[PDB]
Every structure is written in structure tokens, then in C-alpha cells.
Design an enzyme around this catalytic site. Structure first.
Site, PDB file in Angstrom:
ATOM      1  N   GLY E  10       0.805  -1.200   0.000  1.00 21.19           N
ATOM      2  CA  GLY E  10       0.000   0.000   0.000  1.00 21.19           C
ATOM      3  C   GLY E  10       0.846   1.261   0.000  1.00 21.19           C
ATOM      4  O   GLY E  10       2.052   1.248   0.259  1.00 21.19           O
ATOM      5  N   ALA E  12       0.446   3.628   2.138  1.00 25.27           N
ATOM      6  CA  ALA E  12       0.834   3.790   3.534  1.00 25.27           C
ATOM      7  C   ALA E  12       2.009   2.889   3.886  1.00 25.27           C
ATOM      8  O   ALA E  12       2.859   3.259   4.704  1.00 25.27           O
ATOM      9  CB  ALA E  12      -0.352   3.491   4.448  1.00 25.27           C
ATOM     10  N   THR E 137      -6.059  -1.124  -1.758  1.00 21.37           N
ATOM     11  CA  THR E 137      -4.985  -2.106  -1.867  1.00 21.37           C
ATOM     12  C   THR E 137      -4.588  -2.626  -0.490  1.00 21.37           C
ATOM     13  O   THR E 137      -4.341  -3.824  -0.310  1.00 21.37           O
ATOM     14  CB  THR E 137      -3.782  -1.490  -2.584  1.00 21.37           C
ATOM     15  OG1 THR E 137      -4.196  -0.965  -3.851  1.00 21.37           O
ATOM     16  CG2 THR E 137      -2.701  -2.535  -2.817  1.00 21.37           C
ATOM     17  N   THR E 171     -10.261  10.073   5.928  1.00 19.06           N
ATOM     18  CA  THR E 171      -9.985  10.558   4.581  1.00 19.06           C
ATOM     19  C   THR E 171     -11.059  10.108   3.599  1.00 19.06           C
ATOM     20  O   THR E 171     -11.480  10.886   2.735  1.00 19.06           O
ATOM     21  CB  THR E 171      -8.610  10.079   4.119  1.00 19.06           C
ATOM     22  OG1 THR E 171      -8.590   8.647   4.081  1.00 19.06           O
ATOM     23  CG2 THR E 171      -7.530  10.573   5.068  1.00 19.06           C
ATOM     24  N   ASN E 198      -3.911   7.504  13.217  1.00 21.89           N
ATOM     25  CA  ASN E 198      -3.242   8.742  12.838  1.00 21.89           C
ATOM     26  C   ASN E 198      -3.699   9.916  13.694  1.00 21.89           C
ATOM     27  O   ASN E 198      -2.988  10.922  13.796  1.00 21.89           O
ATOM     28  CB  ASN E 198      -3.488   9.028  11.357  1.00 21.89           C
ATOM     29  CG  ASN E 198      -3.005   7.903  10.464  1.00 21.89           C
ATOM     30  OD1 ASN E 198      -2.404   6.938  10.935  1.00 21.89           O
ATOM     31  ND2 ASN E 198      -3.269   8.019   9.169  1.00 21.89           N
ATOM     32  N   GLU E 246       8.620 -14.687  21.734  1.00 22.49           N
ATOM     33  CA  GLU E 246       8.533 -14.500  23.178  1.00 22.49           C
ATOM     34  C   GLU E 246       7.304 -13.683  23.560  1.00 22.49           C
ATOM     35  O   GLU E 246       6.447 -14.148  24.319  1.00 22.49           O
ATOM     36  CB  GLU E 246       9.805 -13.825  23.696  1.00 22.49           C
ATOM     37  CG  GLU E 246      11.078 -14.617  23.461  1.00 22.49           C
ATOM     38  CD  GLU E 246      11.296 -15.690  24.503  1.00 22.49           C
ATOM     39  OE1 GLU E 246      10.649 -15.620  25.568  1.00 22.49           O
ATOM     40  OE2 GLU E 246      12.118 -16.599  24.262  1.00 22.49           O
TER      41      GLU E 246
HETATM   42  N1  GTP Z   1      -0.093   6.780   9.706  1.00 18.36           N
HETATM   43  C1  GTP Z   1       0.006   6.925   8.388  1.00 18.36           C
HETATM   44  N2  GTP Z   1      -1.060   6.596   7.576  1.00 18.36           N
HETATM   45  C2  GTP Z   1      -0.965   6.742   6.233  1.00 18.36           C
HETATM   46  C3  GTP Z   1       0.205   7.221   5.661  1.00 18.36           C
HETATM   47  N3  GTP Z   1       0.031   7.265   4.324  1.00 18.36           N
HETATM   48  C4  GTP Z   1      -1.216   6.829   4.035  1.00 18.36           C
HETATM   49  N4  GTP Z   1      -1.850   6.510   5.208  1.00 18.36           N
HETATM   50  C5  GTP Z   1      -3.216   5.970   5.336  1.00 18.36           C
HETATM   51  O1  GTP Z   1      -3.667   5.575   4.057  1.00 18.36           O
HETATM   52  C6  GTP Z   1      -5.004   5.963   3.835  1.00 18.36           C
HETATM   53  C7  GTP Z   1      -5.175   6.361   2.375  1.00 18.36           C
HETATM   54  O2  GTP Z   1      -5.305   5.228   1.545  1.00 18.36           O
HETATM   55  P1  GTP Z   1      -4.033   4.336   1.117  1.00 18.36           P
HETATM   56  O3  GTP Z   1      -3.698   3.323   2.184  1.00 18.36           O
HETATM   57  O4  GTP Z   1      -2.859   5.240   0.832  1.00 18.36           O
HETATM   58  O5  GTP Z   1      -4.520   3.631  -0.244  1.00 18.36           O
HETATM   59  P2  GTP Z   1      -3.697   2.439  -0.946  1.00 18.36           P
HETATM   60  O6  GTP Z   1      -3.090   1.498   0.065  1.00 18.36           O
HETATM   61  O7  GTP Z   1      -2.656   3.010  -1.875  1.00 18.36           O
HETATM   62  O8  GTP Z   1      -4.827   1.688  -1.807  1.00 18.36           O
HETATM   63  P3  GTP Z   1      -5.393   2.387  -3.140  1.00 18.36           P
HETATM   64  O9  GTP Z   1      -5.244   3.886  -3.037  1.00 18.36           O
HETATM   65  O10 GTP Z   1      -6.847   2.025  -3.323  1.00 18.36           O
HETATM   66  O11 GTP Z   1      -4.598   1.885  -4.321  1.00 18.36           O
HETATM   67  C8  GTP Z   1      -5.270   7.122   4.779  1.00 18.36           C
HETATM   68  O12 GTP Z   1      -6.538   6.992   5.377  1.00 18.36           O
HETATM   69  C9  GTP Z   1      -4.191   7.025   5.836  1.00 18.36           C
HETATM   70  O13 GTP Z   1      -4.758   6.626   7.060  1.00 18.36           O
HETATM   71  C10 GTP Z   1       1.281   7.554   6.472  1.00 18.36           C
HETATM   72  O14 GTP Z   1       2.319   7.981   5.973  1.00 18.36           O
HETATM   73  N5  GTP Z   1       1.177   7.405   7.838  1.00 18.36           N
HETATM   74 MG    MG Z   2      -3.135   1.305  -2.993  1.00 21.61          MG
END
Ligand code: GTP
Ligand code: MG
Ligand code: GDP
Lengths: 58, 51, 42, 426, 431
Positions: E10, E12, E137, E171, E198, E246
Site C-alpha cells: 500500500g 501507507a 490495496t 480521509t 493517525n 517471546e
Molecule cells: N499513519 C500513516 N497513515 C498513512 C500514511 N500514508 C497513508 N496513510 C493511510 O492511508 C489511507 C489512504 O489510503 P491508502 O492506504 O494510501 O490507499 P492504498 O493502500 O494506496 O490503496 P489504493 O489507493 O486504493 O490503491 C489514509 O486513510 C491514511 O490513514 C502515512 O504515511 N502514515
Molecule cells: Mg493502494
């Protein structure tokens, strides 16, 4: 934005004073080579718990 | 084995690490201030573009 | 003779005590650190 | 002649055995290389009890080290005296138990148990008349307790007419560093009680208040703690290596400390320890030694014997000394504190005298005492085991690895039987 | 000797991974080229005869616009140019697209790359999976890798760092839909899973770091510090060592409850490190503090079952055990009836490292706490209401039904989680 993760080159300031890692060369050798195996024949001298072969006579 | 047995030695190696950490975080403060100066000149630059 | 031996024993004890404090002062003054114990970029 | 094979179990065992063999090496005059550097002739007279002969005038160590994680032997070999240990005596697994007594007993411990079975009979018959074995382990985790309590069971069937020492480290309520720790201790002691000869109770709470209130120091690392435990570990077997006026071996201590086969739990102690600020203020004489010997702050266990009855005590002394003084002082404390002693054994004391003191000292002593207050620890762990087991908690790590639910029940019944046996003598 | 294979999936996952792998390369003396300017790096970095240290990581995404920055960043040469994988048409915040349609073309090729990374490693401790609940994803594609990993590897350790959607802010809109469909399947084939919010990382940075407005870039540094604290026992010597197997046996008491919370302390500014003194007791009361809790839930509403503490720095067992005794004497912290002793401790000698451009300071001693608490019902019950009022009219379903999943999965997800909630209450009730 994500260029900020590695914008700045490493500086000898930003490091801990102590650095004591793990050392596994000695362990890896004795892990790679097995921990002994008995395919040997029995060889132990006959022994008595009181005395080993006295001088009994007369 | 003398180093592992002594204790005043442990006291001194506890103190000298803090004496190191003080200077490390002081120059870290200096790094933070120069980053703030960079942000200030960024703001002035973008104000010039607006004008 | 027994009393004199006891006095000798006390003197030997205080001498060994002074020797071990001198050794801890020396190992305090000179400290050696291993290159495996120091960081690679440090 | 008389030989003891050392057995070393767990991360706690390796950390405490490295300090223990350093202590023996200073006492017998062995350099970190292994060669003999001694100023006397007597130090080589009894050396085969703990050392084996090698070429070039070197003494290697009779000792097997068992582990499941290989991260513990590297600290031993890179440590203070790790260059003297024979490399073939180290045995370690490819994965850890995971602080689970289940893994070290049934699933994971059953593969490495073959290899240490091979090395323990490489050193058992190399002697002439084997006195006994000595195990050192802890009851806080499954690496040294799960492997330890099954290694005891198999060796007893092979070598019945010997003596087995084990230095158990009982879990403590305040230094409880493991959640599943009452599960490990109850299942280990149940197997331990049937198949051993001597047990010792080292408690880290009693290590903490001794090193804080008596030694008067600020930073007690585990190296300092393993030094004070090894003083009692070495001082018990002084009669095996050094000539004395009243020699007393391990079996000689054993036949007077066990009135019954299920009564083999002791309370260690070390007399002449003193802080450096009060060392020059105290005259070291044997009435001062037996005064500091018997007060409740010197026991290496977390029990107060004022709530219990003294079953049988002994004291092994070290140094050139006179035994009218020890017999007068020990009769004095026998007659004074008449309430704390049992009346069905008059002359509750064994006394042993060794001529040679530890290095840096002129007189020393080691205390072994069997008491009724040992049930205080057992009931503390029994209620915690019952509280955890009655809510069906933490069992899927255990009943999913080859256990039915009845083994905890028979272990609980055996502990309740053991505690009730201690109750009738109070 | 030990190692753990980390996978980032992802947007994230890879954004955390960039701050993540920057931290260990500086921690283990690795230049951005991948070279030195001990064998402790065998837990993360492989070995090549040139002296090269390829990290044992797989970077997974369905969208190449975040991976290509890694392809053009400072760390071009360090990362292997085939472990970082990418897909097409992303997932567009869909569980159904990531699980059924789009995720099926990449699932064969990724499993070759765990296979290609696992043959070198003689002994494997476990896998770390970094993902998010909100992303399509991160929800759908992760819902069946955990199925494929379980049927390929039997009882290997699995750890999840999961971006849990914030209770107040969100979001996305179908973010509850993606979260429930993961929490239908992610129970029976996951060994452990830490929840990260977050929201609670934001107010801590506002209060305890003297910074008003951070981004994701300076946000993942704290997440990197927590996972650095977990794995530092594997990498460096310490008085007490804790492996992956552990603390997983010591935290979770039941197979249905594997969701702990991870607090970190101290989090302080560089100007305030000169002001505060930091003892062992003074850093372990902050991790028990509900204000510094990392999950938006108050443990005062609940009860504790198990705790794991990872002390790192210049600590002694005396100050640790004195502080545990002090915490237990307080009436605010409540433990359950069947657990009298719920603590496990870890000691690491090496002090924490600091990153250029970071927000924290160089601290002699720190701690992270891994605790399981009966207070996370209120977060689960909250999106239970959020799901139910969104689901009341049968809305936002034509973007899921037409992809290939039927309508019975939602009702099966709801009865599964409601069974989880009632199992969760019957555990927390007293005897
Ligand atoms: N804590 C944290 N959360 C993040 C970060 N970047 C993205 N996220 C999380 O990711 C969400 C946005 O969707 P993504 O997970 O980026 O989407 P993806 O995994 O790329 O899946 P698709 O966009 O459908 O291809 C937000 O709601 C955030 O909570 C980060 O750098 N730190
Ligand atoms: Mg994705
Ligand atoms: N007395 C003493 N106790 C120790 C030592 N090392 C560890 N411990 C104790 O042992 C407990 C953990 O035991 P553990 O190492 O897991 O045993 P293992 O599972 O057999 O390796 C901790 O609570 C410590 O207090 C030591 O060197 N001496």
C-alpha cells in the site's frame, strides 16, 4: 514531500556513543557443524567403587 | 575482568555518556535554527513571486 | 610472635587496599575502547 | 577419585556459570589461558574433581552448556573465561522455546535432548568413581526449566546410585518478569520433586535486598549477583578440594538434611559479606560470623523463618580456626532460640571445618538450612497458578502442543500434597 | 543468524517503509549507496561478495506513482530493483477490487519473491506486514496474502502494523466498508496485529514535540522508532533479550484477541531534553499516562491483561523493578482478576539513534510499551454504529457487488464481529 526522508547526508554528530553489536561467527560455525555423534565402540576400564585392584595376598 | 568488577568505573561511564549527549543535542539545536532560517527565506522568496 | 603476625596481617591488608584504589584510579585515567565497540562512521 | 560433572542450563545458567567458573579459577590458580599459575603446591592436589587433563599442562573445564537460543553462548565465549571451555561441550538449538515450558519439554526439547545425551556420557565414564552431577538452572523460563526438568528425569533412570544437585531459581512475586511464569514453575517442580536429591532456593528478591542493604552499593548488575551466589556454590564443595579438620562432602550433607525423600529444599546464606565502609569497623571473629549467619536478612530466599520452625541446619566453615568456639556459639544459639527449633531432633546442627579460606579473606562460612518456612513460597505460587488456571487462560499454547488438561490437575494435586506434608511439622 | 522478512504494501506501507529503512541504514552504518564508508545486519540486510547489503524487504503497491519516487530518490542503488513491485489501475479504495479482480494478477508474482527471499534464510523468525485499513490495496489485497501465506507457511510468525481509521476524522467514505471486510477475515490467520491511529499521533506531536503542523514524512519516524525498539533485541546485545515468539505468547491470552497497543516514551523536544531529567521511573509513568496513549481510547474505561516493556539505553534492573512496584501500588491502573503478574521486561544496551531532519532528541534512555487492554471496545463499537447507519439503506454497494463478491459477505462480517465483541466482553468480566 518524500524526498525529505534522505535529504541530509549522515553527520558523525547524530550517532550514539555506544555501539555493541552481536557476534555470531563462533556460533555459526558450531551450528553449521553438528554437535557430536556416538558411532564409537564401548571402551571403559572395569572399576570398583571401593578400591581399584588391591594387592590381596597370603 | 578488572573493568567488569569495578563500580566507580561504572559511575564514570554513566556520567561521560551524558556529557557527550549534552553537546550532541546542543549542535542539534543549531541544526534546527538553520532549518528555520531556510524556511524564513522560503517565505520571503514566495512573497516576492506574489508581488 | 602471634601478636606481631596479626599486626603484619593488618598492614598487608591496608597496603592491598591502597593498591587496588591506585589501580582503579589508573584504569579511570586510561580508558581504551575497541574499534568493534565504536561506531563505523564514528 | 571423586569427580563432579557440571551441567549448565538456560540463559540464567550460562550467565551464572561463567561467573562461577571464574571464581573456581581464582581459587585454584588458573589463568584465562588455562595454564597453572599458582604459588602453592596444594592447589594441584585435588584438581580432577572439576578439571580434566589436556596436553601442554592445561586444565580444561568439565562442564556442559545447554541452550536453545544461540545468542547466549556468544556472550560466554567472548566473555571473561570463555576461552577455556571446550567447544564441543556447547549445545544450542536453531530456535527458542519462547518462555514456554511446553516447548522445552515436549515439542522442541525432544530433538536436542539426544545430543546432550551423547556428550554427558562422553564425560561421565572418563573419571574413576563418579560422585555426582551438578545442574544450575532457573524456573523463570522454559529454556532452562523445560530442558532442565526432563534432563533430570532421563539421567536418574541411567545413573540411580549417584547424587544430583540442582540450584533452582524460584520465581518471586515482585520480580515476576514473565506472565506465564507460575505455569512454568508449577509444572517444573512437580517433575523436579520426585527425581532429585538436593535443591537450593535462590530468589532474586533476596539477592536484591542483600546487595542493597548489606553490601551498600548503587548499581548491582547481574555479574555482581552471580558473584555472591557462586560464593555459596563454591563454599559448599570446599571439602571436596581442600583438606580440613572436619571434611563434609555433598552426600555427607545430604544424609542429614533429608529426613524424608520429599524434604530436600534449603535456604542458603553467606556470612562474612560486609560493605567496604564497615569492613574496617568490624572485627572478623566467628561469634560475629554466626551472629550475621542466622539473621533473616542474609537468606538467599524470600522467606522469614520466624514464622516457621527450623528443621535442620548446618554450617561449613573455612579458614584456620578453633572448633571449641564454633561448638560453644552454636550451642548458645541452640539454647537461646529454643522456640524456633523442632524438639524431635536434638543437636539440629552439622558442623564442617575447612582449613583454606577464599582468596582475600581469612575466615568464611556457608549456611545450609532446611526449614518449614519453605512452604511460604509454594503457597504463593499455588494461589497464582490456581487463579490463572480457573479462568481457562493461557492454555492454547500448552494444550495445543500435546497436553491434555489433566496434567495441570495432577501437578496441582502433587503441589497440594507437598504443601500439606510441610504443614504437619509446624 | 536470526532474521525477519518485512513487507510493505500500500501507499501507507511504502511511505512508512521509506522512513523505516532510512533509520536502520543509519543505525547499522550503511550508506545510501548500500556500502560501508560484526554480522548484526543479518536480521535485515543480506550479504553479497562485494560487501553489499541488500535489505530483505518487498515493496508492494498497485500504483506506480509512489514507487517511482523510490526509483528516483536518494536510495535508488540500495533497494533491489525487482523487490519493489507495482501494479496497474490501483484499487480506488475498494476491498472487492483489491481482493477479487485486481489483486489476482499480482498475487502469483509476489509469492515468488517471498520464495526468492526465504530460500537464503536458514532460520526464519517471522514476517512483518505494514498496511492500512483505509486503502483499497491495503484492505483487499492484504486480505488474501494472509490466506496464501498461511497455506504456504504453516506456523510462521506474522506481525501486522495496521493504519486504523481515526474515530473523528477520516480521509475516505467507504473506509468503514474496507475496515469491516478485513476484520471479518483477519482473525484466524494473523499471529499479532498492532493498531495505529493517525489521530493520536497528531496531538502527541502538537503537545510533546512543540511542532504545530507535521506531514506524513515526519510522522513515520515515530512508527519507525517503535518497530526499531521491537527488533533491537534481535540486533544488539542486552541484559534481557526478547524475540518475536517471546512476546506473542506473553501478550495474547486467547486466539481471538491479538490486538495490543504500543505506547512510546519519552517523546520530547531537543530544547526540552536539556530541561527534563529522564530516569527509568520518569519514562515509564509517561507510557502509562492516558494522554500519551497511542490509540484514541482511554484505558481507565477498561482493564489491563498483559504488558510488555522494552527499555533501551542506560537502565538497571533495580530502577525498573522499583517502578513496576510503584505502578502496581497505584489504584488508577486496573488489572484483571485472573492475572496477578502481567509484566514482561526487556533491556537493550545500545541507546537510540537520531536522524537528520528529525523531530526527537538524542536521549540516553527510552521505553516502548506493548499492552493489551479491555478499553478498545469503544473504538470497535464506534464504527459498529458508523457501519450500521451507513448500511441502513443498502448504499455504496454497486461499486462492490458488480466486481464479483455477493451480498452475504456483509452480514457474515457483521455476525463475526458481533461474536468478537461478545467474546471480548465475556473475557473482561470478573469472576
Ligand atoms: N499513519 C500513516 N497513515 C498513512 C500514511 N500514508 C497513508 N496513510 C493511510 O492511508 C489511507 C489512504 O489510503 P491508502 O492506504 O494510501 O490507499 P492504498 O493502500 O494506496 O490503496 P489504493 O489507493 O486504493 O490503491 C489514509 O486513510 C491514511 O490513514 C502515512 O504515511 N502514515
Ligand atoms: Mg493502494
Ligand atoms: N540470579 C540470577 N538471575 C537471573 C540471571 N539472569 C537472568 N535471571 C533471572 O531469570 C529470569 C529470566 O530467565 P530466563 O533467562 O528467561 O531463563 P531461560 O528461559 O531458561 O533462558 C529473569 O526474571 C531474571 O531475573 C542471573 O545471571 N542471575
Amino acid at each position: 514531500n518524500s524526498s525529505h526522508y534522505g535529504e541530509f547526508l549522515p553527520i558523525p554528530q547524530f550517532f550514539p556513543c555506544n555501539y555493541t553489536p552481536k557476534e555470531q561467527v563462533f556460533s555459526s560455525h558450531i551450528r553449521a557443524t553438528g554437535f557430536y555423534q556416538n558411532n564409537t565402540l564401548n571402551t571403559a576400564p572395569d572399576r570398583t567403587r571401593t578400591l581399584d585392584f588391591p594387592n590381596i595376598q597370603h | 575482568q578488572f573493568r567488569e568488577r569495578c563500580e566507580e568505573l561504572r559511575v564514570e561511564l554513566l556520567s561521560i555518556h551524558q556529557k557527550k549527549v549534552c553537546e550532541e543535542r546542543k549542535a542539534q539545536i543549531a541544526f534546527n535554527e538553520e532549518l528555520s532560517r531556510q524556511k524564513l527565506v522560503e517565505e520571503q522568496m514566495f512573497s516576492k513571486l506574489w508581488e | 610472635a602471634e601478636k606481631e603476625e596479626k599486626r603484619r596481617e593488618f598492614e598487608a591488608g591496608v597496603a592491598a587496599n591502597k593498591m587496588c584504589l591506585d589501580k582503579v584510579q589508573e584504569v579511570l585515567s586510561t580508558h581504551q575502547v575497541l574499534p568493534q565497540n565504536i561506531h563505523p562512521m564514528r | 577419585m571423586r569427580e563432579i560433572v557440571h551441567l549448565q542450563a538456560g540463559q540464567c545458567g550460562n550467565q551464572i556459570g561463567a561467573k562461577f567458573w571464574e571464581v573456581i579459577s581464582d581459587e585454584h590458580g588458573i589463568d584465562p589461558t588455562g595454564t597453572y599459575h599458582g604459588d602453592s603446591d596444594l592447589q594441584l592436589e585435588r584438581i580432577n574433581v572439576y578439571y580434566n587433563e589436556a596436553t601442554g599442562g592445561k586444565y580444561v573445564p568439565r562442564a556442559v552448556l545447554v541452550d536453545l537460543e544461540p545468542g547466549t553462548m556468544d556472550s560466554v565465549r567472548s566473555g571473561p573465561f570463555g576461552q577455556i571451555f571446550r567447544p564441543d561441550n556447547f549445545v544450542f538449538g536453531q530456535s527458542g522455546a519462547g518462555n514456554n515450558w511446553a516447548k522445552g519439554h515436549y515439542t522442541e526439547g525432544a530433538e536436542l535432548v539426544d545430543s546432550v545425551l551423547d556428550v554427558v556420557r562422553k564425560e561421565a565414564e572418563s573419571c574413576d568413581c563418579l560422585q555426582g552431577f551438578q545442574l544450575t538452572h532457573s524456573l523463570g523460563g522454559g529454556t532452562g526449566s523445560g530442558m532442565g526438568t526432563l534432563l533430570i528425569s532421563k539421567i536418574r533412570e541411567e545413573y540411580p546410585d549417584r547424587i544430583m544437585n540442582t540450584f533452582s531459581v524460584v520465581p518471586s512475586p515482585k520480580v515476576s518478569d514473565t506472565v506465564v511464569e507460575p505455569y512454568n514453575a508449577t509444572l517444573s517442580v512437580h517433575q523436579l520433586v520426585e527425581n532429585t536429591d538436593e535443591t537450593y532456593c535462590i530468589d532474586n528478591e533476596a539477592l536484591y535486598d542483600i546487595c542493597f542493604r548489606t553490601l551498600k552499593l548503587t548499581t548491582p548488575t547481574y555479574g555482581d549477583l552471580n558473584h555472591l551466589v557462586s560464593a555459596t556454590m563454591s563454599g559448599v564443595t570446599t571439602c571436596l578440594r581442600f583438606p580440613g579438620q572436619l571434611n563434609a562432602d555433598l552426600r555427607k550433607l545430604a544424609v542429614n538434611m533429608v529426613p524424608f525423600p520429599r524434604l530436600h529444599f534449603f535456604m542458603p546464606g553467606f556470612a562474612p559479606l560486609t560493605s567496604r565502609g564497615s569492613q574496617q569497623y568490624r572485627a572478623l571473629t566467628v561469634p560475629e560470623l554466626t551472629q550475621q549467619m542466622f539473621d533473616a536478612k542474609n537468606m538467599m530466599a524470600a522467606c522469614d523463618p520466624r514464622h516457621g520452625r527450623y528443621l535442620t541446619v548446618a554450617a561449613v566453615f573455612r579458614g584456620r580456626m578453633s572448633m571449641k568456639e564454633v561448638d560453644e556459639q552454636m550451642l548458645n544459639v541452640q539454647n537461646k532460640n529454643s522456640s524456633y527449633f523442632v524438639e524431635w531432633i536434638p543437636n539440629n546442627v552439622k558442623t564442617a571445618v575447612c582449613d583454606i579460606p577464599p582468596r582475600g579473606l581469612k575466615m568464611s562460612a556457608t549456611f545450609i538450612g532446611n526449614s518449614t518456612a519453605i512452604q511460604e513460597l509454594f503457597k504463593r505460587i499455588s494461589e497464582q497458578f490456581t487463579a490463572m488456571f480457573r479462568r481457562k487462560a493461557f492454555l492454547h499454547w500448552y494444550t495445543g502442543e500435546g497436553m491434555d488438561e489433566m496434567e495441570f490437575t495432577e501437578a496441582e494435586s502433587n503441589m497440594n500434597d507437598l504443601v500439606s506434608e510441610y504443614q504437619q511439622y509446624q | 543468524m536470526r532474521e525477519c522478512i518485512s513487507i510493505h504494501v500500500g501507499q501507507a506501507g511504502v511511505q512508512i517503509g521509506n522512513a523505516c529503512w532510512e533509520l536502520y541504514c543509519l543505525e547499522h552504518g550503511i550508506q545510501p549507496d548500500g556500502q560501508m564508508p560484526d554480522d548484526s545486519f543479518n536480521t535485515f540486510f543480506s550479504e553479497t561478495g562485494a560487501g553489499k547489503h541488500v535489505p530483505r524487504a518487498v515493496f508492494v503497491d498497485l500504483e506506480p506513482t509512489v514507487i517511482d519516487e523510490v526509483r528516483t530518490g536518494t536510495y535508488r542503488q540500495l533497494f533491489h530493483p525487482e523487490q519493489l513491485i507495482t501494479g496497474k489501475e490501483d484499487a480506488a479504495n475498494n476491498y472487492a477490487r483489491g481482493h477479487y479482480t485486481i489483486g489476482k494478477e499480482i498475487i502469483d508474482l509476489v509469492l515468488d519473491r517471498i520464495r526468492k527471499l526465504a530460500d537464503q534464510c536458514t532460520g526464519l523468525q517471522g514476517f512483518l506486514v505494514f498496511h492500512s485499513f483505509g486503502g483499497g490495496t491495503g484492505s483487499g489485497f492484504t486480505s488474501l496474502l494472509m490466506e496464501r501465506l498461511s497455506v504456504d507457511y504453516g506456523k510462521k510468525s506474522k506481525l501486522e502494523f495496521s493504519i486504523y481509521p481515526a474515530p473523528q476524522v477520516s480521509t475516505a467514505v467507504v473506509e468503514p466498508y474496507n475496515s469491516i471486510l478485513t476484520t471479518h477475515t483477519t482473525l484466524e490467520h494473523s499471529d499479532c496485529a498492532f493498531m495505529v491511529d493517525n489521530e493520536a499521533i497528531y496531538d502527541i506531536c502538537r503537545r510533546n514535540l512543540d511542532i504545530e503542523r507535521p506531514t506524513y514524512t515526519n510522522l513515520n519516524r515515530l512508527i519507525g522508532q517503535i518497530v526499531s525498539s521491537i527488533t533491537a533485541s534481535l540486533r544488539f546485545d542486552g541484559a534481557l533479550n526478547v524475540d518475536l515468539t517471546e512476546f506473542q505468547t506473553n501478550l495474547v491470552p486467547y486466539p481471538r484477541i491479538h490486538f495490543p497497543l504500543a505506547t512510546y516514551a519519552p517523546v520530547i523536544s531537543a530544547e526540552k531534553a536539556y530541561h527534563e531529567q529522564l530516569s527509568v521511573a520518569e519514562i515509564t509513568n509517561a507510557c502509562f499516562e492516558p494522554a500519551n496513549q497511542m490509540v484514541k481510547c482511554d484505558p481507565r474505561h477498561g482493564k489491563y491483561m498483559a504488558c510488555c516493556l522494552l527499555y533501551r539505553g542506560d537502565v538497571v534492573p533495580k530502577d525498573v523493578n522499583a517502578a513496576i512496584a510503584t505502578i502496581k501500588t497505584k489504584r488508577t491502573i486496573q488489572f484483571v482478576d485472573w492475572c496477578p503478574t502481567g509484566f514482561k521486561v526487556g533491556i537493550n544496551y545500545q541507546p537510540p539513534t537520531v536522524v537528520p531532519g528529525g523531530d526527537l532528541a538524542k536521549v540516553q534512555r527510552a521505553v516502548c510499551m506493548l499492552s493489551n487492554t479491555t478499553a478498545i471496545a469503544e473504538a470497535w463499537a464506534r464504527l459498529d454504529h458508523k457501519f450500521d447507519l451507513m448500511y441502513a439503506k443498502r448504499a455504496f454497494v454497486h461499486w462492490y457487488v458488480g466486481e464479483g463478491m455477493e451480498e452475504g459477505e456483509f452480514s457474515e462480517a457483521r455476525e463475526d464481529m458481533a461474536a468478537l465483541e461478545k467474546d471480548y466482553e465475556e473475557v473482561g468480566v470478573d469472576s
